[PDB]
Amino acid sequence: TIDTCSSDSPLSCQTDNEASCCFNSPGGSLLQTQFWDYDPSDGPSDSWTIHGLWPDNCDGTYQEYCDESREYSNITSILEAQNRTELLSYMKEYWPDYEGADEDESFWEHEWNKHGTCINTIEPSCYTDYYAQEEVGDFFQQVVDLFKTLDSYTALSDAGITPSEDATYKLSDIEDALAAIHDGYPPYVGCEDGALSQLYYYFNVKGSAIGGTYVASERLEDSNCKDSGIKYPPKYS
Numbered sequence: 011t012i013d014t015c016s017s018d019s020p021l022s023c024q025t026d027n028e029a030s031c032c033f034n035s036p037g038g039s040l041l042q043t044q045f046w047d048y049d050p051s052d053g054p055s056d057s058w059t060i061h062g063l064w065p066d067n068c069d070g071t072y073q074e075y076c077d078e079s080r081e082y083s084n085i086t087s088i089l090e091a092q093n094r095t096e097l098l099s100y101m102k103e104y105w106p107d108y109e110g111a112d113e114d115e116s117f118w119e120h121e122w123n124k125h126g127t128c129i130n131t132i133e134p135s136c137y138t139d140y141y142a143q144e145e146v147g148d149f150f151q152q153v154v155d156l157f158k159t160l161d162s163y164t165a166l167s168d169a170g171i172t173p174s175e176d177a178t179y180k181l182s183d184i185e186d187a188l189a190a191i192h193d194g195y196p197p198y199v200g201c202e203d204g205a206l207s208q209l210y211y212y213f214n215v216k217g218s219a220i221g222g223t224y225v226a227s228e229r230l231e232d233s234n235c236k237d238s239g240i241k242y243p244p245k246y247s
């Protein structure tokens with residue numbers, strides 16, 4: 011399985027170290043991203059859903075599509091062959107493609123192909139007793155594991171911010187509510203058509219992107235929402 015690194019490994023971006031299986035670089039800013047899909051709606055009525063996990067450069071630029079030799083068109087088959095049946099079921103529910111389950115496969119391919127291949131600490135050479143595409147399955151499990159710790163809907167709700175046909179909301183309230191689950195660092199807050207739509211939670215990493223310690227870090231992009239008037243549309247309305 012993946013190599014392990016010391017829990018006092020140096021923090022990506024925040025320190026100056028050499029890329030290795032125990033140092034995420036140049037992709038040292040890891041973004042756990044989420045969606046609020048209301049039209050069409052997906053996922054539970056009271057949960058956001060997974061967009062992905064992206065390695066950005068420390069300056070906010072990013073690499074994409076970093077390894078054509080490890081791009082795939084069969085993520086669902088890879089997960090089944092690895093017996094990750096509960097992970098796959100969870101993905102269908104919490105990492106949906108909005109268009110429908112039949113588009114889930116292409117969405118997951120996109121996320122692995124585009125972004126997973128750019129996570130340097132995930133490469134096969136970072137494994138003991140590697141088996142073909144082990145890191146692909148490991149990556150999907152890690153996204154889910156991080157997502158589970160970032161329950162945006164509850165954090166918002168606890169701050170009095172719940173989807174509504176009529177209520178509208180202030181950016182800074184949205185930001186503060188979400189910062190409370192992220193060590194005081196707000197996520198990127200993305201709106202569409204004046205509706206709350208996307209979140210990026212930024213982290214730096216001690217050790218490997220699989221299994222290392224994810225440390226809440228400062229957002230490298232703030233928001234494209236207006237300061238107020240933000241709609242939080244109810245799902246399945």
Ligand SMILES: *[C@@H]1O[C@H](CO)[C@@H](O[C@@H]2O[C@H](CO)[C@@H](O)[C@H](O)[C@H]2NC(C)=O)[C@H](O)[C@H]1NC(C)=O
Nearest residue numbers: 079080081082083084085087088089091142143
């Ligand atoms: C998913 O697709 C990949 C890419 O084709 C499969 O891995 C290849 O398997 C072929 C045919 O068995 C091997 O000869 C190649 O060497 C493999 N390529 C790599 C990069 O490993 C993989 O087996 C597929 N997985 C499942 C479960 O269907």
Ligand SMILES: *[C@@H]1O[C@H](CO)[C@@H](O)[C@H](O)[C@H]1NC(C)=O
Nearest residue numbers: 090091092093094141144147
């Ligand atoms: C999945 O189970 C099959 C059949 O038991 C086994 O051959 C295979 O090695 C397993 N793979 C993993 C990753 O657990």
